[PDB]
Amino acid sequence: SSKPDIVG
Amino acid sequence: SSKPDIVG
Amino acid sequence: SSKPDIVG
Amino acid sequence: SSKPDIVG
Amino acid sequence: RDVEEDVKGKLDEWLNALVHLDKQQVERIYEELQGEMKHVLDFEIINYYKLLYTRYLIMKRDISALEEELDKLKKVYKKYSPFQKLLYMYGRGLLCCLQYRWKDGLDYLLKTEVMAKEQGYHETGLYYNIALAYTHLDIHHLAIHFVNMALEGFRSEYKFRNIINCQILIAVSYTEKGQYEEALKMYESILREATSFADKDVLLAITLSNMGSIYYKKGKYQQAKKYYLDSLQLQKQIDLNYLDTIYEMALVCIKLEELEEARTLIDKGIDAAKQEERFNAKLYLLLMLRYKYFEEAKDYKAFLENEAIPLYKVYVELAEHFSSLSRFEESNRYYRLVIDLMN
Amino acid sequence: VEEDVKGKLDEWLNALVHLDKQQVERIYEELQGEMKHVLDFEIINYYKLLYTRYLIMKRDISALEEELDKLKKVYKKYSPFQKLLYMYGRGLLCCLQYRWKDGLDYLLKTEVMAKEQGYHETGLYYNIALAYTHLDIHHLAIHFVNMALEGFRSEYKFRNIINCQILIAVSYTEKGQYEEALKMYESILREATSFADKDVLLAITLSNMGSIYYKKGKYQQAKKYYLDSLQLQKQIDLNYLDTIYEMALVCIKLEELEEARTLIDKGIDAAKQEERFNAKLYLLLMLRYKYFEEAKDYKAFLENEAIPLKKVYVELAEHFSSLSRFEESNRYYRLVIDLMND
Amino acid sequence: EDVKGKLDEWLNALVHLDKQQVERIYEELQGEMKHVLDFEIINYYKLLYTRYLIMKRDISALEEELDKLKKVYKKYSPFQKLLYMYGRGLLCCLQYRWKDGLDYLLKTEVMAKEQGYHETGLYYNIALAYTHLDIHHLAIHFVNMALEGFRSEYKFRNIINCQILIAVSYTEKGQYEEALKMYESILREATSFADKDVLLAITLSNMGSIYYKKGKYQQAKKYYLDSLQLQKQIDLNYLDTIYEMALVCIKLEELEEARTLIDKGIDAAKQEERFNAKLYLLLMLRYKYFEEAKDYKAFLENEAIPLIELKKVYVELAEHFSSLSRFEESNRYYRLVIDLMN
Amino acid sequence: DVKGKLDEWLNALVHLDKQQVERIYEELQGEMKHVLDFEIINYYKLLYTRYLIMKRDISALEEELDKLKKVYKKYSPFQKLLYMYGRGLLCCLQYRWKDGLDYLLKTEVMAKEQGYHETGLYYNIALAYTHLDIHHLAIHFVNMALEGFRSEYKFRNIINCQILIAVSYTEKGQYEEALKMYESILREATSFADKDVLLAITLSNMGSIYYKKGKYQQAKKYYLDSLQLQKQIDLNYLDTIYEMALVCIKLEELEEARTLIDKGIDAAKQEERFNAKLYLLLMLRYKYFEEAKDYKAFLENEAIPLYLKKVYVELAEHFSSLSRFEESNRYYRLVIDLMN
């Protein structure tokens, strides 16, 4: 349940 | 719902 | 050589 | 013009 | 002895014609080999012809002769080549799909999928069929996955007439589980581009029906009736989509306070659903509606039990709230049955 | 003026872009009866610039030309989008009457105007790539049919997608391998019958596929394709003349030359009718005066060495002139290599 | 007016997420904007500084600056309104408020459709937000357009993350094997990146979760171990990985170790507020498997206050717990479940 | 069971898992002592040929392939394919893209007949066409390679594909689009581990088209930065040195030109593979230093490496636009005849 990082 | 016919 | 027609 | 390299 | 690879060659050409559905080439090679097959003694070639003839029989939509032929070829399935086994499983799959048993069809199509995956074989239409079964099985994510995998191949060799159907399946995918506006844009472009085909009426009927469902769910029943009728005036020949369409229109009219009128339509669908054995899934469903409105009693429970037996479910919750009037304790078991449906 | 004339052009514009004849012709005559209210310049101008595309789809070239001339004198003041519509209009109208170069040079300006504006017309990509295609083996044609296909697939323009595939097919054809084009045509021929307008697709595809077997060899194999293509020729167009001329090539290269004479005669009689058959008439009259008269060979070129508006006719007129008139030929390769360079 | 173009250049560097150029332009324009007069220009600079502030992950200063920018929203350019909505969106994303963030991102989306402005990062952020908001069909729907944009802008470093989103989508949707086949391909092609460690960490963690759901608890703790080996920060991925580790450890009937894990998560989550939701999760887990007291039920009411399908999971857990004892509560519970979940 | 692990090592050779390839190889050095199954031994020999094409051991590669050619008759279709592929990449590393293209195409049709698919093969063929100058086939194959790599998440290869299509653009027009692509690469070639090579070749190319536009003041800059980040000597190095010599000779600065060209020729002198890039360098020396000397003296040894050749033949008669009479028209006939 791991998600990458946002763009910004 | 309405679904299309198969292939053949 | 033959070609398709334009858009319109 | 410089070109990339072969796969391998 | 050299004739063998020539006949096998023409068999491969007939297979090629069956995959591309070139009915002209299909019939031509059919009558080119049906009379030339008289001097064939090799088991392999004979079985190839017998298996291609099953797909040719699928083209004719003769489910009886198809089922009988498959029954004949079931006894000799053991000596079949893996590709012949592939063809047999595929034929049985489409056979089950024509009998509207989408579960069994899904089984044989999945086995056909792994068998085709092992041999490195690739028929783009297979993914479309599996996807279609998935859409028939109350909108799956695998439906989206498989229509995508089918789209990747259809675009590769210009089969747009299938692509549009894939887009319809995608539109339904957005329709049932998600919001409706995107699906409405989908159907809009579909309508705007289906007029270039030689079979506009079917696409327009399906599209208009699905859009009618979109509205009915979203709201504005009066907006839905128009689309429903506009599809009904195009459907002509009776099939599953027709019965479902009249069920949907009846579902709209009963909320539009027209009542009895819809019932007539329901009857118009009920007697028509008794003609074929494949329409059962709709037939009983229609009945499930009738007994729900003009026969509100305890017999409702019993009948919907008798319908709960073969239909392997929106019923459980309804029977639960029907159990709300009497004793409580026994209820939640049906809720756990819903849970097992979710699992 | 102040209330909802373009206020309903949010529903009409979609009909103008998606080519939906139903709503288009539903609000066309409505507009015709609801346009005598306006006195504004902007309202009438780009509605005339809607009229130009409303007319080019109805194929009325003369009125398009006159309207072009009338919209040219007021083109200077207004307006950026109207300017885009005028450049696109003159580009297409020019592409109608053969003149592919004059259409191209301003359809490029149309391209940079549409690019700077931010608006996106897939039809612009398709049409400019069509111009490129008619201007021979252009890679920008490939680029633009890719740019057009990427959007077409999201717009479900299958009928346009197949046309893009035809452009890629003739590109690949006139460029090299032929075989890929043969396969693409092999797929189109079977996948064209699903459309309602299959006849034109079959005609064009069988025509080009017939042209491939000419370069391939055994022209008799091409003869049947030319026959089937000519049997499906409905009205009039340049590609018809291309088909009959290529059939004439198939004949003259073959043993039989007697039929080729009649085919050439038919070509001449059919080409000298209108304006768009100019270059085709001149190339159909080339070999006739070059390989029959012999004494009238250099005369034809002398008359139209400066009227092709390159490789073949400057190579063949300098193939034996590689041994005669060295002063003329050697310093004529200038623009020949220059046009290929820049 | 060169300040304007330099601001547009700063935006150009900010959307590409360039590092050195953004800093350079930031400081030199910080020196150049001593002539602060034009309100719209100044506020434009304030919004570009807002995005620049997002680039450095300074949540507090971002919120305060967005509050100062909030007071004067009435006199904003449409572009400035867009920028404000986006800024508030990412601000909500940094605070792990994925719902609000999704809202601001959707308003930012419709504003982007209105203005005709486009950048793929928006769609990617929306898809990510949905992914955090639990396996939405719109997550895949948006991540496809994200792929569409990124592949046209050569944003491969973002493309692989999109693939990770699709991977967790397929993961929680049920299709484990395809998710594995994608994840392995990610592992193979992550080493070419300069920041491979984070991708490897996430991928191995998710792989551990998949193997955990397959029944292979042996590979799960292994992949978790390698993940912890490769991690280097204290994001929610760390806490979640610790939670998964605790799960697979308690599935092996191991003692104290899982407690040390859940405590190791509890403190680190007690630290910086943001993790409180996640914190609750693990603490709730502890209340389920360590105190053996039903006191959590009281707290369940409390945890029913700030509240996602997780809520459904909690109330259905209370439903199966009640079905073991008292019916009514379970009845109304699952009634609410199946009727509100839709 | 060793056959399956051989297939595993093959898969490792496909995905270029260097450490995995290395360890599995070290396992095979002890595993391949008790087999004697002939086919397995040959399988290991050819997979070791791939191990050689990965380790850039040209001599050992050519020698091994020569030792493997004698028993080519006994290979299975797969092993045949592997021999053809290995040979192709062997002559590719030797900067012989002719034979390379041949063996690569034959390997392609063999793979299409066998039902075997490798995106790397198509990419290699596209690169072979790219090395053979302007090609529609380069784009054609780099698009299939594009789809394949995108399906296999091989981003690092997709970048080089974008470089390929960009290069194919640059040799005609689309300098705008080319600059857009390259500039889009420079910002995205920072998230990699091997940034320096990409930056070097892309700066050399964009500097080459900035030189092609007419803005050389930036060209010298980008070339300088390209030389700044190169840490090896290959064909691309001699290429960017040659181009540097171009932007130098046009900018009147002839001293840096003479130094760069002398250094170029001398550096190309060692490797026998650099000769194909050497024999053109000296040609640039002809148009600037020896001057007006009988071209055929250096051209008699330049007649063979010419198997942009049409540009060379045209230039051979672009200098002779002051003379007469038959030889010019004859060279024209020659180039026109080779145009098709």
3-state secondary structure at position H291: coil
Measure Cα distances from F316 to F246, F312, F322 in Å.
Answer: 18, 6, 10
Cα of first residue to Cα of last residue in chain C, in angstroms, is 22
**Pair of tokens at residue G209:** 């979760």
Q: Do the beta carbons of residue H199 and residue H189 sit within 8 Å?
A: yes
CA angle H217, H218, H223 (to 5 degrees): 110
Domain ranges of chain F: 1-99, 100-342
The shortest CB-CB distance from G54 to any of A1, A2, A8 is to: A8
CATH class of G98-342: mainly alpha
Question: Phi and psi dihedrals of H192, rounded to 5?
Answer: -110, 175
What dotted CATH number matches G1-97? Answer: 1.25.40.1000
Burial E41-72 (b: 16+ CB within 10 A, else e): eeeebebbbbbbbbbbbbeeeeeeebbebbee
3-state secondary structure at position G193: strand
Largest CA distance in chain E: 80
Cα of first residue to Cα of last residue in chain D, in angstroms, is 22
3-state secondary structure at position G232: coil
DSSP-assigned letter for residue G73: G
Chains that touch A (3 or more CB pairs under 8 A): G
Give the determination technique: X-ray
Long-range Cβ contacts of G277-285 (<8 Å, 24+ apart): G277/G96, G277/G306, G278/G96, G278/G236, G278/G239, G278/G240, G278/G243, G279/G239, G281/G243, G281/G310, G282/G239, G282/G242, G282/G243, G282/G246, G284/G314, G285/G243, G285/G246, G285/G247
Amino acid at E241: N
**Pair of tokens at residue B3:** 């679904």
CA atoms G172, G177, G181, G184: torsion sign: positive
Residues of G with Cβ-Cβ distance to A3 under 8 angstroms = 128, 131-132, 164-165, 168, 202, 237
Amino acid at E236: K
What dihedral do alpha carbons G68, G74, G75, G78 form, nearest 10°? 100
H136/F176 touch (CB, cutoff 8 Å), yes or no? yes
How many residues does this entry show for chain G?
Answer: 342
Cα of first residue to Cα of last residue in chain E, in angstroms, is 58
Q: How many CB atoms lie within 10 A of CB H19?
A: 9
Chains that touch F (3 or more CB pairs under 8 A): C, E, H
Nearest to G44 by CA among G36, G55, G56: G36
Query: What's the Rg (C-alpha) of chain C?
Result: 7
User: Is G285 part of the contact surface with chain A (CB cutoff 8 Å)?
Assistant: no
DSSP bridge pairs for H192: G193
Nearest to F301 by CA among F315, F317, F277: F317
Closest-approach residue (CA) in chain E for F190: E22
The shortest CB-CB distance from F322 to any of H139, H329, H339 is to: H329
DSSP-assigned letter for residue F195: B
Q: Do the beta carbons of residue H205 and residue D2 sit within 8 Å?
A: yes
The shortest CB-CB distance from G137 to any of E177, E335, E339 is to: E177
H or E segment and range at residue G325: none
Q: So what's the architecture of H97-340 in CATH?
A: Alpha Horseshoe (1.25)
Task: Report how many Cβ contacts below 8 Å link chain G to chain H.
Answer: 50
Task: Report how many Cβ contacts below 8 Å link chain D to chain H.
Answer: 50
CATH 1.25.40.10 fits E102-343, yes or no: yes
Q: Do the beta carbons of residue G183 and residue G167 sit within 8 Å?
A: yes
CATH 3.40.605.10 fits F1-99, yes or no: no
Nearest to F106 by CA among F121, F94, F119, F118: F94
Nearest to H86 by CA among H115, H118, H113, H114: H118
Nearest to G91 by CA among G64, G124, G123, G59: G59
Burial G77-104 (b: 16+ CB within 10 A, else e): eeebbbbbbbbbbbbbbbebbbeebbbb
Burial H55-68 (b: 16+ CB within 10 A, else e): eeebeebbebbeeb
Q: Do chains B and E touch (3 or more CB pairs under 8 A)?
A: yes
Cα of first residue to Cα of last residue in chain H, in angstroms, is 53
The CA distance from G253 to G248, in Å, is 9
Q: Do the beta carbons of residue E85 and residue E45 sit within 8 Å?
A: no
3-state secondary structure at position G31: helix
- Residues contacting residue G27 through CB under 8 Å, at least 6 positions apart: none
What dotted CATH number matches E1-101? Answer: 1.25.40.1000
Burial F187-218 (b: 16+ CB within 10 A, else e): bbbbbbbbbeebebbbbbbbbbbbbbbbeeee
Resolution in A: 3.2
CA angle F18, F24, F25 (to 5 degrees): 145
DSSP bridge pairs for F195: E197
F198/E198 touch (CB, cutoff 8 Å), yes or no? yes
Residues of B with Cβ-Cβ distance to E245 under 8 angstroms = 2
Q: Do the beta carbons of residue F171 and residue F142 sit within 8 Å?
A: yes
Q: Do the beta carbons of residue G91 and residue G114 sit within 8 Å?
A: no
**Pair of tokens at residue G205:** 């963690």
E173/G323 touch (CB, cutoff 8 Å), yes or no? no
Amino acid at E125: G
Question: Phi and psi dihedrals of F294, rounded to 5?
Answer: 65, -50
Q: What number of CA atoms fall less than 13 Å from residue E297's CA on the CB side?
A: 6
User: Is F292 part of the contact surface with chain H (CB cutoff 8 Å)?
Assistant: no
Closest-approach residue (CA) in chain E for F16: E192
Nearest to E312 by CA among E135, E138, E98, E91: E138
User: Is H329 part of the contact surface with chain F (CB cutoff 8 Å)?
Assistant: yes
User: Is F25 part of the contact surface with chain E (CB cutoff 8 Å)?
Assistant: no
The DSSP result for E197-224, as a single string, is: BS-HHHHHHHHHHHHHHHHHHHS-HHHH
The CA distance from E108 to G195, in Å, is 45
Measure Cα distances from F255 to F227, F265, F292 in Å.
Answer: 18, 19, 16
Q: How many CB atoms lie within 10 A of CB F315?
A: 17
- Residues contacting residue H116 through CB under 8 Å, at least 6 positions apart: H78, H81, H110
Measure CA H162 to chain center. 15
**In CATH, which of 1.10.10.2160, 3.40.50.1220, 1.25.40.10, 1.10.3720.10 is domain F100-342?**
1.25.40.10
User: Is E326 part of the contact surface with chain F (CB cutoff 8 Å)?
Assistant: no
The CA distance from E44 to E82, in Å, is 12
Residues of C with Cβ-Cβ distance to F239 under 8 angstroms = 2-3
Q: So what's the architecture of H1-96 in CATH?
A: Alpha Horseshoe (1.25)
User: Is H18 part of the contact surface with chain G (CB cutoff 8 Å)?
Assistant: no
- Residues contacting residue F342 through CB under 8 Å, at least 6 positions apart: none
Residues of F with Cβ-Cβ distance to C4 under 8 angstroms = 130, 163, 166-167, 200, 204
Amino acid at G115: Q
